[PDB]
Amino acid sequence: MKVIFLKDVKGKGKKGEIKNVADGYANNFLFKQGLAIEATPANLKALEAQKQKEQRQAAEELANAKKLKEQLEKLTVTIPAKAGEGRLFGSITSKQIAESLQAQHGLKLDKRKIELADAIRALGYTNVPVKLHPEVTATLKVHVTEQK
Amino acid sequence: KRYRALLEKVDPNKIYTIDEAAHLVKELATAKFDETVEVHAKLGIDPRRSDQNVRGTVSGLGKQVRVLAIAKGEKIKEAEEAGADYVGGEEIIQKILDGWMDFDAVVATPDVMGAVGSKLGRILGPRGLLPNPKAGTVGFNIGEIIREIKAGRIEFRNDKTGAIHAPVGKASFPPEKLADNIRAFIRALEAHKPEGAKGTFLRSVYVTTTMGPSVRINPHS
Amino acid sequence: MQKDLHPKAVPCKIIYQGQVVMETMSTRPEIHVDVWSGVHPFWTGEERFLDTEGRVDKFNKRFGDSYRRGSKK
RNA sequence: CUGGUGUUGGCUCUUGGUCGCGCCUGCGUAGGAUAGGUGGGAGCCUGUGAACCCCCGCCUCCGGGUGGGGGG
RNA sequence: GGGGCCUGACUGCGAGGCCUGCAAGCCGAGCAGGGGCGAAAGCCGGGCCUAGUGAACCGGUGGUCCCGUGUGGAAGGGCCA
């Protein structure tokens, strides 16, 4: 019995789970029910197919990432605000980061991103380790100044 | 210590060859003086029916083979003069069990063999000292048997539980000689096999040196 | 022809008879019965070209039901 | 009427055999047995280098261990 | 009726007759290999006889090494018992 999983066997792992839930048994209960299919050259294919597709997705984004990755990693974080002689009067929220970086340098990057104890306020040269893609991101250089 | 040493030198699941195994037996018994090597193994048969009893001899002795003569009187005399060496009676039997073992070969005069098989069965049946009949060592011609001992035979005979054994390699006799007699025994016993006996003959076959490590081998090499 | 199995044919033929064996294991045999009988599998529920139900039996079943060759489920 | 089999699927509770492995373990009355027995003898003269001999207490009649303390 | 060693109460065979509708059944000198009893002439092919019995098949088992369904094997079979 080529048990083609569409969920459980435990709870729902509809991933590469063809079990021998034998004959009319697994047969009727399980898929009559409606929680998967029998090999079906059509579905052995299926599985290899949609899996492939997700693979394209994954590696792919790895790439979108990397491109934006090296480019930014290279560039310089330029941000102008107001203050006194150390920390701006209105705190730096990388929210502000995005607004700015995208707004002026051109690239589109999150907010929930980056890594931040919190808002900073002691100007210019301080760098931010900024998460970007799940296993690689960019620790980058940020400079802000009171354009005064 | 003495033995964890040895214990790591051999393995927990492998059947080496006769010459090779030999090299390891010596590898293991550095012990005092020298540790006699023997062969010990399992006979797929059954002892509760005299029919399978695998015993007799296999083929070094000489005019050197000191012999004991187990008899009750006239036979004490006969063994004596014939040319025994240590003659006596059930008394000699009790001394052998107590702490005496000098004789090389032992003969018994068919009127004390019960004694020979039960007091010292477990005194003579290891190295071979329990008067063996159609194996020149028991008979009203105790003198005759003691006279013949020499030629170069070392016996063997299945113990009640199925294992047979004896001396197949001095821990010093060349690994080649170790392989030599280990093999020869393979032959003598292998053949000795009892008639009404099926299944699989040689079960577990091992070699070693009395006190110490025991290696299982393939008596086919 | 209302007993068969849609996918293939399996009803009929079938002639039994008993004896009193004991043969190739020393000495011959002996012949008895002379009867004929039925012999088949089992049917169940599915549908074709707007309802129908099906029937068929065991074997074919596990099959055509798993799939379908001239109707469906 | 009745064992196996078929579409007669899930969940858990359970006692049986079997071979394998892993360590257990006794009684034919000082020559018929020592912790059975055959290969031995109780070590053919012996083994981690922590309880070594003397000494309490802990585990299926006990050694496997036992905590040691002790130690020519 | 006793003692002595011994076992032919053997194979391969039997020329030729008894009784016979059938198959049976029964008998036997001599011939060959191979023994046993005696010195040997010779007897010994169960027994003092006439009852102690039975087809053909159907199967077993101890030899054969004939047949072996492509040939090399073997299931299986033919023959001896």
Swiss-Prot record, chain B:
<dbReference type="GO" id="GO:0015934">
    <property type="term" value="C:large ribosomal subunit"/>
</dbReference>
<keyword id="KW-0810">Translation regulation</keyword>
<comment type="function">
    <text>Protein L1 is also a translational repressor protein, it controls the translation of the L11 operon by binding to its mRNA.</text>
</comment>
<keyword id="KW-0694">RNA-binding</keyword>
<dbReference type="GO" id="GO:0006412">
    <property type="term" value="P:translation"/>
</dbReference>
<dbReference type="InterPro" id="IPR002143">
    <property type="entry name" value="Ribosomal_uL1"/>
</dbReference>
<keyword id="KW-0687">Ribonucleoprotein</keyword>
<dbReference type="GO" id="GO:0000049">
    <property type="term" value="F:tRNA binding"/>
</dbReference>
<dbReference type="GO" id="GO:0006417">
    <property type="term" value="P:regulation of translation"/>
</dbReference>
<keyword id="KW-0678">Repressor</keyword>
<dbReference type="GO" id="GO:0019843">
    <property type="term" value="F:rRNA binding"/>
</dbReference>
<keyword id="KW-0820">tRNA-binding</keyword>
<dbReference type="InterPro" id="IPR023674">
    <property type="entry name" value="Ribosomal_uL1-like"/>
</dbReference>
<dbReference type="InterPro" id="IPR023673">
    <property type="entry name" value="Ribosomal_uL1_CS"/>
</dbReference>
<comment type="similarity">
    <text>Belongs to the universal ribosomal protein uL1 family.</text>
</comment>
<dbReference type="InterPro" id="IPR016095">
    <property type="entry name" value="Ribosomal_uL1_3-a/b-sand"/>
</dbReference>
<keyword id="KW-0689">Ribosomal protein</keyword>
<keyword id="KW-0699">rRNA-binding</keyword>
<dbReference type="GO" id="GO:0003735">
    <property type="term" value="F:structural constituent of ribosome"/>
</dbReference>
<protein>
    <recommendedName>
        <fullName>Large ribosomal subunit protein uL1</fullName>
    </recommendedName>
</protein>
<comment type="function">
    <text>The L1 stalk is quite mobile in the ribosome, and is involved in E site tRNA release. Binds directly to 23S rRNA.</text>
</comment>
<comment type="subunit">
    <text>Part of the 50S ribosomal subunit.</text>
</comment>
<dbReference type="Pfam" id="PF00687">
    <property type="entry name" value="Ribosomal_L1"/>
</dbReference>
<dbReference type="InterPro" id="IPR005878">
    <property type="entry name" value="Ribosom_uL1_bac-type"/>
</dbReference>
<dbReference type="InterPro" id="IPR028364">
    <property type="entry name" value="Ribosomal_uL1/biogenesis"/>
</dbReference>
